[PDB]
Amino acid sequence: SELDAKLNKLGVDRIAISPYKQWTRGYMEPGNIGNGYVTGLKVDAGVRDVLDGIVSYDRAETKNAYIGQINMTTAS
Amino acid sequence: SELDAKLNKLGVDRIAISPYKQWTRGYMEPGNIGNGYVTGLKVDAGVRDKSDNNVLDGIVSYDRAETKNAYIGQINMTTAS
Amino acid sequence: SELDAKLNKLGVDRIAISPYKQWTRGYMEPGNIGNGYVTGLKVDAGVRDKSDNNVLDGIVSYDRAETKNAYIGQINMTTAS
Amino acid sequence: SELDAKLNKLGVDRIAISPYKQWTRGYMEPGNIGNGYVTGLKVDAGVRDVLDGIVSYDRAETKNAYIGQINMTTAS
Amino acid sequence: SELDAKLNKLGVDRIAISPYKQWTRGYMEPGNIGNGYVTGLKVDAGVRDKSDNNVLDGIVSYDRAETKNAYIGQINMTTAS
Amino acid sequence: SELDAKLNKLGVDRIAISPYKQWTRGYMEPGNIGNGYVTGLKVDAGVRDKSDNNVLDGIVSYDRAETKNAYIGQINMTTAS
Amino acid sequence: XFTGVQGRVIGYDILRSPEVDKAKPLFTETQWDGSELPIYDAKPLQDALVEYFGTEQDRRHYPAPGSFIVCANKGVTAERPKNDADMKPGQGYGVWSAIAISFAKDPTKDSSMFVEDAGVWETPNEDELLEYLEGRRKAMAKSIAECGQDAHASFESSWIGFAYTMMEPGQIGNAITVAPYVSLPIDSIPGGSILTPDKDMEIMENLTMPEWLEKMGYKSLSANNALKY
Amino acid sequence: XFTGVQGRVIGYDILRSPEVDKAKPLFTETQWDGSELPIYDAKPLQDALVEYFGTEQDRRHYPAPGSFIVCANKGVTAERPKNDADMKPGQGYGVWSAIAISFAKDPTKDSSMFVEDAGVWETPNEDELLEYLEGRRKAMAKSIAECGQDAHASFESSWIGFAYTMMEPGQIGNAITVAPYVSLPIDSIPGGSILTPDKDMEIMENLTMPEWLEKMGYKSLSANNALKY
Amino acid sequence: XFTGVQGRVIGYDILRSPEVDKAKPLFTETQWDGSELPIYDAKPLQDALVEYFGTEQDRRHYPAPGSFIVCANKGVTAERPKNDADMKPGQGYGVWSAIAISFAKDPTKDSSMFVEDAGVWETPNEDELLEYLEGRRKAMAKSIAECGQDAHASFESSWIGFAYTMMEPGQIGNAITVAPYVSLPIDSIPGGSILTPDKDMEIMENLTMPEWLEKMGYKSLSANNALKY
Amino acid sequence: XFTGVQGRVIGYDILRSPEVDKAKPLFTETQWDGSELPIYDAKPLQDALVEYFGTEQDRRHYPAPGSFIVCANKGVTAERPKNDADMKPGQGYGVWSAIAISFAKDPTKDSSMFVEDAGVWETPNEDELLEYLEGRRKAMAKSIAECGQDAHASFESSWIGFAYTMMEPGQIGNAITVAPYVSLPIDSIPGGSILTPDKDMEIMENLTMPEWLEKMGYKSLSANNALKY
Amino acid sequence: XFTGVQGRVIGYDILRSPEVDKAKPLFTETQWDGSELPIYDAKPLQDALVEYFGTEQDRRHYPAPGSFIVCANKGVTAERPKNDADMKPGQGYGVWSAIAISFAKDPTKDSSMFVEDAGVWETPNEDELLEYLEGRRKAMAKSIAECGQDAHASFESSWIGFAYTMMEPGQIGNAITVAPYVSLPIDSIPGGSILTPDKDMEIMENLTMPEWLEKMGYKSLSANNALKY
Amino acid sequence: XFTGVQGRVIGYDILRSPEVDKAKPLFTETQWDGSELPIYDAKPLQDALVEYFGTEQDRRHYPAPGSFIVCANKGVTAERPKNDADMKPGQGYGVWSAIAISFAKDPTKDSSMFVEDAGVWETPNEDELLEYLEGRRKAMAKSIAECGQDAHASFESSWIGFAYTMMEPGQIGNAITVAPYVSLPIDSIPGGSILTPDKDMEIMENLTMPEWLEKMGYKSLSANNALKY
């Protein structure tokens, strides 16, 4: 978009492409094409009747927008 | 420096270059030229007259210290230890 | 192995090569050749006799377990979960 | 164009970009971005009143569409 | 083969891979993977009942030999010697 | 040199590095590091005593001049003009 | 967190939801320059990510098995005991999470920001919690506006949304808020190619989420608000 | 030569000349499938390359000093003696060169082809040469059509043009035909960027040569046929 | 966490321990498809990483000074007071850590998983702890099996192992569990080369840990169970 | 954290502060080899990073909006209540943070290390805190020296510095210690170029912080100790 | 031309012809070290390239339309006039071309060499030409052996082959000798991948030309000597 | 050809010969701007390339076996018959080759140029040829100066040199002139590294040919004019 054109003059691009079939993958992983990233919003909570933390976690990760089996790293 | 020359014989370089205009950017980000990193020292402490929310009371004091002195505001901080 | 061949048809490879002499290095670091990773299992603990206050005495038992057995001393550990 | 899209499915692209300021440069030279080429048509002859071959040559190379001072390599 | 292993210690590899579907392509072309080349042997002789023009009488007999037997038709031949 | 600095502002560099052990190699070959070239001057000739017919006896005087003095023997010479 | 000069947000910048332009602001909060920053419910954007990754059951362009996705994330977990209706205090009846994205006015100078929060609920009245959540919103807006002035980053909108649960009976509850940072596969891009990277991004930022679905043969997983958080 | 799956031709595929669509075929030659291959004068295309590289005097995006440009090329040189009006036979009065480009019908399966020729002129009548050149055209068409069947490559058009000279008085003459193979600089692409490679090519193939000029602030070096070959 | 389509595990997928095939399952736990997932002690695999990185004292292909290794990790620390044999409760007598790896049955569709745990020990009887640890195992198996169904990922084995300590006298204890994610150096690969990347991986997945050692001139640091955790 | 074979530290290895060579050690602590490791105040180095990134108000080569900077960092936050001068114990009057860098003697074999700490202050006397901080220093030195022997890494210097605050009146306090890991922009390098990467680093390690400023047209933001932590 | 440290030859080093090992030397020529260099007919190797590129009619992995293939090549063309059975001397009755490849003994130190020749035939007796060609062979061997000593490159074999034609009736004849320098497509490599480059080469150098055909579903275009030159 | 913005010439720009600065011009030729372009004998530069590639016998950093070196080159060959002292005219007694390099005054705007020539000698007096060669020089200078104006490229020097031979007795003679275009190996660069590319070039352009030799342990193959052309 017209913004990318202002951006490119600074050395910045927002291209983020995954080499794989079907799957997205994480920003900074090797073999991605492009120097940018795409993001999105997930908020979920599941009610279920260290391990404690882990199984309810997976339950929220596979609830709705699927991000199951990901090696989550944190930024803040 | 003469140390880089000892280093290079091991496969290591300390080159760390940002493609951008003005901004530095983080080690390991795509498009950086070089296989090394530069680091520096920041210690600062900031404040803000309370609210209801501890989470949001740490988030806003956080930003206050990040933009105090050496500016690292609006960065996606990741932690190593 | 025959699995890599199924993998490659999806765009995936498990090649993970370090440019350096002797040392391994971390997945995603710049200059590594390949788009995969190798992992391993370390569980260690110790007994590390008394001190001066919280953060510092902690940090030191840490180093003690990092250099106990399989050596990962002096690494900038980043966490995934 | 729609043809490039048929082409790309075969591994082929027609992207040919020069890293320099102002100048075009030759297909296959290092640092060009892209795996394709652009071509064009030059026919010229200059009347002028081994060396013989060389100076009239330059005269036709700098006549009209300028390709002067190029290290011409031949394909046929 | 065992020779490639002696070669690699000198910085040389004989890897020559074409990005395309079906077609081979020439050594040194952009986008080829690898830093080596593969070669082969073609000797053929072709003809065509004359015209007015020697230039064009070599161009058309040329094509005739290029598309005779092992097909290298429509290639931008460059010469080494 | 100070000229390279004027050059670099145009996108041009004169870096020309061979991946191999001992050998130089040609500009534009894959795996060379850099986007420039180095050149030099060779003029040589010889006296190479009589033979069997055209192409072959020629080729042999050629090799004789290529391996006379500054060695460029066994090269796949391509021509620019 | 942040999304700066390198980023785009699903549902907004690429694969935009009709719901987004049709959205009406819940209210406005003032910021340091004196602009009224409108605040919106993030439901378009959240549903949007479900269309793209898909669900456990309708898996679409989700992250690769074992991939390393860096995320902006916070979580929290709590028990609501067996009968023992006395909360030894890391305990509670309900649990919630929240996320806000505030789009920078000038994405060339300033970054867009994410704010995420989470806690437990010390009461059993679901409705009482709800009242509280719409309070937390205005609190987050204030945290956005504070932060804005910290870096003199005026924003142009904010989109905030929540999820939660009301546990009972020794069922443990976990609420997570997370903004992932990904790169898109070619087979998700209608007519994209591994050789046309920059055009690929322009296809996605030029499609609407309905068009993207129609062209991918994908049934809308939201449409008549079928998605719950 | 050839221009195959990797190429585009200035004046035709990118930066197209209005003159091209407005062109009217000089004639047609039959080819192996039974299609009438129209034949055109290549003047649009030749003028086109002058707009892009420019002239010695109005240097534009010409090749880099010392660059290695591979070209399809043929040349020829000849003296037309001092007085000595007897041609010891590598000699002649005039000298000429020619180039034809034949666009493949299916650029996915087949390559477009270039045919180039050159010779000397054994007569002093400029007009007599001209007559001959328009003969050579139909000869080249025949060489195109022969070659076409060699590889079962039907073409969809051919564009042929010539340049020459009539020497006199010990002035040596040199005629060259050359199709260069280049890569385009970013400052030639109105609004292109070193980070948007594939879009850059689409800008050039979407501009006409007048638009490209107007946007670059470039005066047309041809326009009212100001260009001679 | 996970190890998916991009990964291999030292001791199992590359540089495999004889101990691995010779291993006998401690037991099996059922999973959602009705397969009995065997469970094993992870000691082969743990010793395996010691052969490759080496020890402080016998440093081999350990990570580079200052390198950034992302790891799946958990730790925990605790005092066991000076005399004051009353534990003000973040205190304890012993401390432990644990790690399990569960290899996916189909590594093309599903990721292998790591589960790691850690805690303190409120008793001084080492043996009493041990009893507890072998309990924790079956608990972890259950947490594996739960998780398995979450993503319909059946596994084919699990390998679980622990380390710990029994502190006394104001000695602080720290237990860490960590799965590092590395890339291998060429001088660790017998006959590998920086120019043969994919073959390099095949060398390592075709060597056994004894062969790798014999070819590297490396003395086995485990062999007669010489390695303690 | 660590800074090993791949790193350089601003103010010391590149853009060195005159203050650094002119520094005088606050004291020495013994380490495992029997060398007296001198210890210094880190103020040169801290001011140094302010010259390079600049301030909110004088923004220089700071990190890109939304960039992902991995940092060695610790923080801590605390209230000092409204009036209610009784600290329910996650509360305090002051708050502090600290960072130490210990340069390895042999940066080829060993990594340089960072140690960072943080806490709250249970007293209102600013001076009483200060006394404590200069105590914490020698404690950190001891933690450096312990760690040194862990890896038989002798260092050659340490540079330690603190920042803090004394809150009152329900003002919450946050202290952060952070060592960021960046890559330098070309427009920060006087006479550097995107084509000369390794020379670019040599320019920065050959300039002093005054020279760098003079050549960049940058006013010193420290100079007469104008910078407070 | 030469084929040195970077090259492999189709039919010999990769996709080897059974005919090659089954070949019997036509004779030996001495070289500077005193080794008898055996000389063979190149027909296995020539047929070999036909299996891989295929023919106009059975197009297989031939070079890309418009690609730039550098080749070692020589050609020659001649008329054999209309009736006018007097050869104005660039004319002749037949025309021929030849190619030899001499594999270096030590491909680490020395390059393998190609020698190629071509001419016209001044007689109409096809058989008389043939006699001459088998003479030319021993001449080429001598040119190989001369050249060998020039660079002290002993070879281990030579493989020489010819093609030609006997024109009559104003039919022009063209003989070409050419050794092309290519890179292989993945779909030609049974079970190769764009991610396994070095293994791809090892597949091709481990297949025989029959195996390669059987695995590609390709009918042998030579087999019972069906290929003419 | 040319050597433009991308090139450096051995002996002049890198590994410079003392002989070069100590050289004294043989004469000057005027060029289009009115500058006296000095002309020099190219012997420093020619000897220079012998120091770097070495000889058949003292092989140094010569081109790789089978490598593809593009060169500016011309050659010529001729017989000087058996006795038959009558030259059927492609025959002669001696044969020569020549090369000139003219360094552009502004290497940013203009390219440096190479001019190379070759012919046969129709007389047997070696000295008579020599007289002729020093004539050819001034002719080449004129061809340089003509060309200079063609592109308004003023040069700042020219360096011209020749080699030849005087055949007799059916010995065929071949004279070649060639300017190769190479890239330098790391082991030729005293203290260079595959990781420091741009510094590598600066090492070579900062060494003199004597220093380069002394540091490489290389005996000067010229020194007391030991090199003949």
Swiss-Prot record, chains A, D:
Instruction: Give me the residues that bind substrate, please.
Output: D58, S76
Provide the protein name: Histidine decarboxylase beta chain
The gene for this chain is: hdcA
Q: Which residues of the full protein are shown?
A: 2 to 82 of 311
